[PDB]
Amino acid sequence: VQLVQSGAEVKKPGASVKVSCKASGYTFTGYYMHWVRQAPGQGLEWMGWINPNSGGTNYAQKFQGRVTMTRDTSISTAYMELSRLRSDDTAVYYCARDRGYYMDVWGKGTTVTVSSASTKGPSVFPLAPSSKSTSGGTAALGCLVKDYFPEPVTVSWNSGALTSGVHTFPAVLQSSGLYSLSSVVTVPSSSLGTQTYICNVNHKPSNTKVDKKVEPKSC
Amino acid sequence: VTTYKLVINGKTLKGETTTKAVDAETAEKAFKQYANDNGVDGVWTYDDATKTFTVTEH
Amino acid sequence: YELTQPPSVSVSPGQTARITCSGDALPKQYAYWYQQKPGQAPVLVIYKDSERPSGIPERFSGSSSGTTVTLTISGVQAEDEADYYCQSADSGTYVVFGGGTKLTVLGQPKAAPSVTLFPPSSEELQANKATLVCLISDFYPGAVTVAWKADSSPVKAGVETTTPSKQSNNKYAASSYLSLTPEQWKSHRSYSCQVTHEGSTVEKTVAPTECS
Numbered sequence: 001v002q003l004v005q006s007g008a009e010v011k012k013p014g015a016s017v018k019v020s021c022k023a024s025g026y027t028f029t030g031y032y033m034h035w036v037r038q039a040p041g042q043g044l045e046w047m048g049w050i051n052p053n054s055g056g057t058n059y060a061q062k063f064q065g066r067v068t069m070t071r072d073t074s075i076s077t078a079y080m081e082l083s084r085l086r087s088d089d090t091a092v093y094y095c096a097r098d099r100g101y102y103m104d105v106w107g108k109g110t111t112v113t114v115s116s117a118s119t120k121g122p123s124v125f126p127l128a129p130s131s132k133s134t135s136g137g138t139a140a141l142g143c144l145v146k147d148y149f150p151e152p153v154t155v156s157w158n159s160g161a162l163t164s165g166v167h168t169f170p171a172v173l174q175s176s177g178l179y180s181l182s183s184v185v186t187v188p189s190s191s192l193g194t195q196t197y198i199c200n201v202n203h204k205p206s207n208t209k210v211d212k213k214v215e216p217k218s219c
Numbered sequence: 220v221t222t223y224k225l226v227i228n229g230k231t232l233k234g235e236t237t238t239k240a241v242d243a244e245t246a247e248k249a250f251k252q253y254a255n256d257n258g259v260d261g262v263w264t265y266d267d268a269t270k271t272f273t274v275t276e277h
Numbered sequence: 278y279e280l281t282q283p284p285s286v287s288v289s290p291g292q293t294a295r296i297t298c299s300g301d302a303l304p305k306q307y308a309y310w311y312q313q314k315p316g317q318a319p320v321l322v323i324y325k326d327s328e329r330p331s332g333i334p335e336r337f338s339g340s341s342s343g344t345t346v347t348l349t350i351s352g353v354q355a356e357d358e359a360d361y362y363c364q365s366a367d368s369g370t371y372v373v374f375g376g377g378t379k380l381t382v383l384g385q386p387k388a389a390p391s392v393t394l395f396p397p398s399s400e401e402l403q404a405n406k407a408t409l410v411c412l413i414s415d416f417y418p419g420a421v422t423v424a425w426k427a428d429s430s431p432v433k434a435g436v437e438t439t440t441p442s443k444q445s446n447n448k449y450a451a452s453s454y455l456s457l458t459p460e461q462w463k464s465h466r467s468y469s470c471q472v473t474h475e476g477s478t479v480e481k482t483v484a485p486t487e488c489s
C-alpha cells in the first residue's frame with residue numbers, strides 16, 4: 001500500500017501547478033484521497049478530497065475557485081492543480097488516503113516553491129561587538145549577510161584561523177523573497193582593541209566573495 | 220553580454236563580485252547599486268585591460 | 278471552526294505525556310492524532326478518539342471528554358519526541374487540523390535563551406536601510422516566541438523570525454529581524470526584542486547613536 005508523488009515544482013507568482021499521486025497496493029476507487037499541505041515550519045493544512053470512483057470533490061473554502069482535484073482511474077492517479085500561485089503557497093503537498101474522514105496512508109509529499117526572486121549577492125554589514133556574558137568576560141560580534149538569493153552562503157572567520165565560538169545561524173526567508181543570515185563569534189572582550197575580526201562571505205551563485213572587518217565602533 | 224568584475228577596496232569591506240552586461244557603462248550601474256547597498260562611499264576606477272571596476276575608500 | 282492544542286509540551290523519559298485538543302464540535306465528531314518527525318510525512322497514531330492502529334506502540338492511547346480530547350503516551354520514550362496534530366471536522370463537511378504540539382522528551386535540563394540584540398550599522402544607515410538583529414541561542418526545549426517594541430509600543434510590521442533549529446549541543450537557536458527606515462530608527466529612544474521561553478521572558482534593548 002503506497003502513494004507515489006511527482007517531483008518538486010519551481011514556479012513564479014501567478015502561475016499554476018499540477019502535481020500527481022499514484023496509488024498502488026489497494027483499490028484506488030475504494031477510498032477518498034485527501035490533499036494536505038504544510039508550509040515551512042508550519043502546521044498541516046487540509047485542502048480537500050476527491051472520491052476517485054465518482055470524481056466528486058470537496059474543497060476547503062479557502063481554496064475554492066483556485067484548486068481543482070481530478071483523477072484517472074485507468075492509471076490509479078490523483079491530481080491537484082492550484083492556480084494563481086502566491087509565495088505563501090510554498091509548501092510540501094501531501095496526498096493521503098482516507099480510511100473511513102481521516103488519513104491512514106500518506107505520500108512522501110511534493111514540494112512546490114513559488115518565488116519571484118532572482119540571483120542576488122548579499123550585502124554584508126557588521127554586528128558590532130556587544131556584551132555577551134559579563135561574568136564570563138566575553139563579547140559577541142558578527143556579520144549580517146543580507147538580501148541574497150539563492151541559498152546557501154558560506155561564512156568563515158579570519159580566513160579559517162578563527163573557528164572556536166563561531167555560530168552561523170540558519171537564514172530567514174523575507175517577504176521580499178530574499179534571504180538573510182547572521183554569523184556571530186563569541187570572543188574575549190579584552191581582545192576587541194587588539195585582535196582583528198573579519199568575516200569571509202562566499203555566495204557562489206552570484207560570484208560574490210567579500211570580507212567584512214567588524215570593528216568595535218558605532219559610527 | 221559579457222562578464223565584468225568589481226573589486227571593492229573599502230575601509231572595512233573588501234572583496235569582489237561580477238555582473239553581465241552589454242557594455243562597461245551598464246555594468247558600472249549594477250556595481251554602483253551593489254556598492255551603494257553595502258554603504259560603500261568611494262572613488263571609482265576602471266581597468267579596460269581586465270574588465271575590472273574598482274571602488275576604493277580612503 | 279478551529280481545534281486548539283498547546284504549542285509545546287515537555288516530559289521526562291518514563292513519565293506520561295498528555296496532549297490536549299479542544300474544539301466546540303468535538304462532542305459528536307471523532308478526533309484523530311498524527312505524529313510527525315522531521316523530514317517525514319505524518320503517521321496516524323490514534324483514530325476515532327481512542328482506537329490505536331495495529332502497528333503503533335500500545336503506550337499510545339486516546340480519550341474523549343466533551344469538547345476536549347487527549348493523546349496520552351505512557352512510559353514515554355525518547356523516540357516519541359515529535360510534533361503531534363489533532364484532526365477532526367466541523368456538519369462534518371470540512372476536515373480541520375489543530376495547530377500542532379511539539380512534544381519534547383527531556384534529555385537535559387531546561388535552559389533559557391541567550392539573547393543578543395544588535396542595532397543597525399552606520400553603513401547600512403548610509404545605504405538608506407536599517408535592520409535590527411535579535412539572535413537567540415542555547416534554549417531548550419526548542420520553542421520560543423519573539424515580540425518587538427519601538428520604545429514601549431509593540432511593533433509587528435517588518436518582523437521576520439526563523440523557525441527554531443537544533444544546535445550541536447542539542448539546544449536550539451533562532452533569529453528575528455526587524456526592518457526599519459533610518460528615520461524610524463533615529464526617531465525612537467530605543468527598540469527591544471523580547472523572547473519568551475517556557476513562560477519566562479528575556480529582553481534586550483538597543484538605542485541609536487548620535488554620530489558627530
